[PDB]
Structure 1
Amino acid sequence: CCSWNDVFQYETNKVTRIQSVNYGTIKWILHMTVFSYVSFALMSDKLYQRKEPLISSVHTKVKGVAEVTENVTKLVHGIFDTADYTLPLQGNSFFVMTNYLKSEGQEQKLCPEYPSRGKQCHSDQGCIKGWMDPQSKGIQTGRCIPYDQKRKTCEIFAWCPAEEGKEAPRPALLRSAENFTVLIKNNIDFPGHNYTTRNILPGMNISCTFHKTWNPQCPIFRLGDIFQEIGENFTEVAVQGGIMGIEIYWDCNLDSWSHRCQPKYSFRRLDDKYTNESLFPGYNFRYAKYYKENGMEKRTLIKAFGVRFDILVFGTGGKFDIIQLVVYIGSTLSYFGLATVCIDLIINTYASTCCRSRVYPSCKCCEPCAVNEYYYRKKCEPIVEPKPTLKYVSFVDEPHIWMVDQQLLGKSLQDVKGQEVPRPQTDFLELSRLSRDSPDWCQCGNCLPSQLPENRRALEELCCRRKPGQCITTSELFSKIVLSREALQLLLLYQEPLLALEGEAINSKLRHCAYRSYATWRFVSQDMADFAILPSCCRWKIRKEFPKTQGQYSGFKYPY
């Protein structure tokens, strides 16, 4: 099985070099196109780079103040700075108040609730008892009675008087909260690639303001500009708050030869503009300060509407990795065989006879493509599975050879039908040298009944031709090639120069060589010479020229 010489074996694929401009041109342009697409994808998607998602940290600083005068009994003149509207978070998100309601005497008692649009209840003692409403903050025993002038509400155990249920003002308060300035210091890192960077670099202008075209890299933003860049109106969002999103996209190429790693800023409204009224439309929150005055545990509650800005820092950093390039090249290497596949398809399609039957006469421009057929004769070598039932029979009348692959079921082989096969080119180089008692299944006269078992007798039942005429044995070459004793002796000497030469039982080898000679004569290819069935007239002629004394003649046997 395994030998030391077997290890050092190597197999080269046999090929034939076709000299043609069409095949070479389509080959080269297909190779160039697939190479161009591969390189384009490589340099566009940067598939040679291992990517990694960043890790981000954000620091927000909101600077700006707003004057606002309370509603006139007594009038107030107040100022709002970052200490009040801004929250202690100050990282990755920040709140900018744009409207506020306040209740000073918030304390626990059994007063009613504010009448909303639908909450206006005129019935007396109709409300549920111990309902624990999510709308009104207190658990209620109904006892509905009027505290307003022309309306009423249920008796609630919430913080009183008249805290919830009130709508926001219109126009919005704190309209000066649009020129406020946000400084966003963002620091991103790629730990696998080990590259840390940040938004602000040395030399950046401090007094800049972000704009889409003039100074995009400036990390200083104005809220009005944020809302105007996407067409949003700051006033309606100031009446009822919202949720904005500052997208910071990093597309970082950490390669030194093309190093670029900077952010791109975008803005997107996060809260649903057209949202249901039952759901909480805007972003709001209600917080209070607790205190004890006159012995009563009480508090003061303010509900603030404003815009929450989510700073969404995302991106990807790519760095050259050899393994990714290797995998991509290994994937794309298979496409270079597209040219060979297409050309082989062309050759196999134009080699068929259907192109000569229908295509070439009708089209009349694919006529020179018949050349492809010749390439098929140089590309393919059709063989057949040497089955035991495989047989080959020839007839002088017809030009082709019949492949009788079917099995014998007692019927005479002369009438069995098979697939025609064209005879080979005969290798013209090697060829260029100097009474009526028949079995009734032959058309000639020289046939003879076969002497074999009846189960296997139909194999020898073959004739030299399909219709009556001259027998092939009467030809001039049959006497000279098939059973010319000098010729067979010369052939055997060529195979074994020291043969017995009329010794003991030499006629068997001469008979076998005569069978092989007739086979190679009619069936040129050695694949077809084997598994050939000679006719009875020639078989028994050869047997007469080289009889067997003390034994029967064994017919065709499976060689392999």
Structure 2
Amino acid sequence: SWNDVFQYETNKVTRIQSVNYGTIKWILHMTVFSYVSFALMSDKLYQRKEPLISSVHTKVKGVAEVTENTKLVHGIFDTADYTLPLQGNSFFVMTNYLKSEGQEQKLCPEYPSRGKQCHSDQGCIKGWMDPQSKGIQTGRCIPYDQKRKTCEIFAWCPAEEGKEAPRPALLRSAENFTVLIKNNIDFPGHNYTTRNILPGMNISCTFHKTWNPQCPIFRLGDIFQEIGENFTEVAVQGGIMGIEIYWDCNLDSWSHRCQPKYSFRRLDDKYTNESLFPGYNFRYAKYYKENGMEKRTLIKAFGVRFDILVFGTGGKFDIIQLVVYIGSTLSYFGLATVCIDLIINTYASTCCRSRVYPSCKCCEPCAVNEYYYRKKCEPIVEPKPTLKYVSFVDEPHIWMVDQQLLGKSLQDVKGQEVPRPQTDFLELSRLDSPDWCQCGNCLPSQLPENRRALEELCCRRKPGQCITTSELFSKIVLSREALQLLLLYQEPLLALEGEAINSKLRHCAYRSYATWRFVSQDMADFAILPSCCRWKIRKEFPKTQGQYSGFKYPY
């Protein structure tokens, strides 16, 4: 069994000197290789990709001059006046405000915003909380001014909720403010970190997608203008703007590159329903005790929230990824074999000559695929007991019968026609009768009736001379000298005495007939001799005791 370990199996192959097939093979191989390499390079499937972790630090610069009114009030706003302490992934710049000073808890008329003007105390509801007004209704319609009256609410008073944002925006100058963004990223798996500002960078730059695509200083109005948004209009009610920072980073030494790409995107819907809080604002309150009364000053601050969104991946060569990709793509290199074998097996079909070629004679030279097919494939048949082969001297083909004989004579049974194999020319280049019978020599079978129909076969389908009348039958089958010579060839020291030699000669005659007619040993093994030939052989080599056994299943 140890030799069973030291075995190598290699496939048998046939080789063709064909220009067409070799050319097609190499073309397909090159195509597969080119696509595989292109995909590998384009998608960098040799790399392991890791997402980044980011930190953002922002700084806003700018002073706004605000002139508002009775009297002309001039003032300015600095960063502490329009920005919040947060300086990370988001920052807020106030662009407009409404302020209510000295609020007190008490009853006051609800502000007459859209559809808040009541006509009778029936319209008002006692105890009902109005989230819009931010107070509790007392169910009384009371005057708000000379020509309007509204529901009385308990709230911080005076209540200006629902008041329209001032137009134009008070902090319009914010269009001209600048923000510096510092972005630190890291790929912890690859142990790589970098930042968006490097030594030698200019500090007086201002971002431009063309001239200065790497300056991290942005004018807000320019941010809006780059994407077709009007800062002046958004400043009235506010909005949300995104600054996207994309890092497509290659961390391989021979191709190292990691720099940010900046882009902008509005994040609030422009056509938001008035009931879904259009824009962006928040209310900030300060609380103080004055005159023994606890009071509140509220500012409703409209502005733009800038969301800084940082995303990306870092790639570095990984051998396991490349190995997996190559394995995934290796099987595509059998395309040439699949296609050319398909061509060979398709043009080897007979129908491709009888029908296709007459219509199109350009494909006539493609008949050589029959030769390739016969040199490539060896068809064989499952050797099961009902398998039988018969040959008729009148006909040139062989007939295969692969069904049980339900009493019907094998002569009458139909069968699948198959070609007669060609005998090797090298080896050849040497020196009252039964109704089913018509050769005048067959005899009734001598087996049990259950299996008598097997031996009820003749040498031909039509009346004529028996095959055994030929001298070849006696030369090959009944020539005792030839059979003894064959047996001696197999058993040099054979003893020619007894009935055993007679049986051996009878079997050799059966084999000789079967090999002469069916040629192939696979067919010869399952062949069936005609009754005439069988009984002639048996008469030439009689069996003293017992009746003849007949054909036996080799398996």
* TM-score over 0.5 (shorter chain): yes
How many angstroms does 1:502 deviate by?
A: 2.9
Contact 1:241–1:305 under 8 Å retained in 2 = yes
How many angstroms does 1:204 deviate by?
A: 0.8
CA distance in 1, matches of 2:177, 2:525: 99
How many angstroms does 1:122 deviate by?
A: 2.1
1:489 maps to 484
What secondary structure does 2:299 align onto? strand
Deviations 1:475-515 (A, max 9, x none): 12111011211111111111111111234421111111111
How many angstroms does 1:169 deviate by?
A: 1.5
CA distance in 2, matches of 1:67, 1:433: 121
1:266 maps to 263
Contact 1:285–1:305 under 8 Å retained in 2 = yes
CA distance in 2, matches of 1:257, 1:445: 94
Q: How does 1:96-245 map to 2 (within 5 A)?
A: 96-245=93-242
CA distance in 2, matches of 1:222, 1:443: 112
Contact 1:102–1:300 under 8 Å retained in 2 = yes
What secondary structure does 2:66 align onto? strand
Structure 2 unaligned residues grouped into runs of 5+: none
CA distance in 2, matches of 1:261, 1:282: 36
Contact 2:175–2:219 under 8 Å retained in 1 = yes
Contact 1:125–1:145 under 8 Å retained in 2 = no
How many angstroms does 1:88 deviate by?
A: 1.2
How many angstroms does 1:424 deviate by?
A: 1.2
CA distance in 2, matches of 1:439, 1:236: 114
Instruction: After superposing the two structures, state which structure 1 stretch, 499-508 or 399-408, moved more.
Output: 499-508
What secondary structure does 1:559 align onto? coil
How many angstroms does 1:349 deviate by?
A: 0.5
Deviations 1:155-207 (A, max 9, x none): 11121113211111222221100111111100000000110111001111111
Contact 1:106–1:163 under 8 Å retained in 2 = no
CA distance in 2, matches of 1:344, 1:90: 68
CA distance in 1, matches of 2:83, 2:359: 85
How many angstroms does 1:406 deviate by?
A: 1.4
How many angstroms does 1:126 deviate by?
A: 2.2
Contact 2:499–2:543 under 8 Å retained in 1 = no
Over aligned residue pairs, what C-alpha RMSD do you find? 1.0
How many angstroms does 1:124 deviate by?
A: 2.5
CA distance in 2, matches of 1:89, 1:524: 97
How many angstroms does 1:546 deviate by?
A: 1.0
Contact 1:113–1:165 under 8 Å retained in 2 = no
Matched, 1:28 2:26: yes
Contact 2:110–2:116 under 8 Å retained in 1 = no
User: 53, 56, 61: which one pairs with 1:55?
Assistant: 53
CA distance in 2, matches of 1:220, 1:559: 93
CA distance in 2, matches of 1:166, 1:135: 11
Deviations 1:273-296 (A, max 9, x none): 122111111111110111111111
Contact 1:443–1:463 under 8 Å retained in 2 = yes
How many angstroms does 1:325 deviate by?
A: 0.3
What secondary structure does 1:157 align onto? strand
How many angstroms does 1:74 deviate by?
A: 3.9
Which structure has more strand as a fraction of its residues?
A: 2
CA distance in 2, matches of 1:138, 1:456: 110
Contact 2:288–2:296 under 8 Å retained in 1 = yes
Instruction: After superposing the two structures, state which structure 1 stretch, 502-511 or 244-253, moved more.
Output: 502-511
Instruction: After superposing the two structures, state which structure 1 stretch, 97-106 or 143-152, moved more.
Output: 143-152
CA distance in 1, matches of 2:26, 2:264: 49
Structure 1 unaligned residues grouped into runs of 5+: none
What secondary structure does 2:482 align onto? helix
Moved over 6 A (4+): none
How many angstroms does 1:75 deviate by?
A: 3.5
User: 439, 448, 456: which one pairs with 1:453?
Assistant: 448
User: 30, 40, 43: which one pairs with 2:41?
Assistant: 43
TM-score of the two chains, using structure 2 as the length reference: 0.98
How many angstroms does 1:65 deviate by?
A: 1.2
CA distance in 2, matches of 1:399, 1:121: 113
TM-score of the two chains, using structure 1 as the length reference: 0.98
CA distance in 2, matches of 1:504, 1:447: 25
CA distance in 1, matches of 2:409, 2:522: 24
Contact 1:254–1:318 under 8 Å retained in 2 = yes
Instruction: After superposing the two structures, state which structure 1 stretch, 547-556 or 37-46, moved more.
Output: 547-556
CA distance in 2, matches of 1:74, 1:157: 33
CA distance in 2, matches of 1:121, 1:460: 117
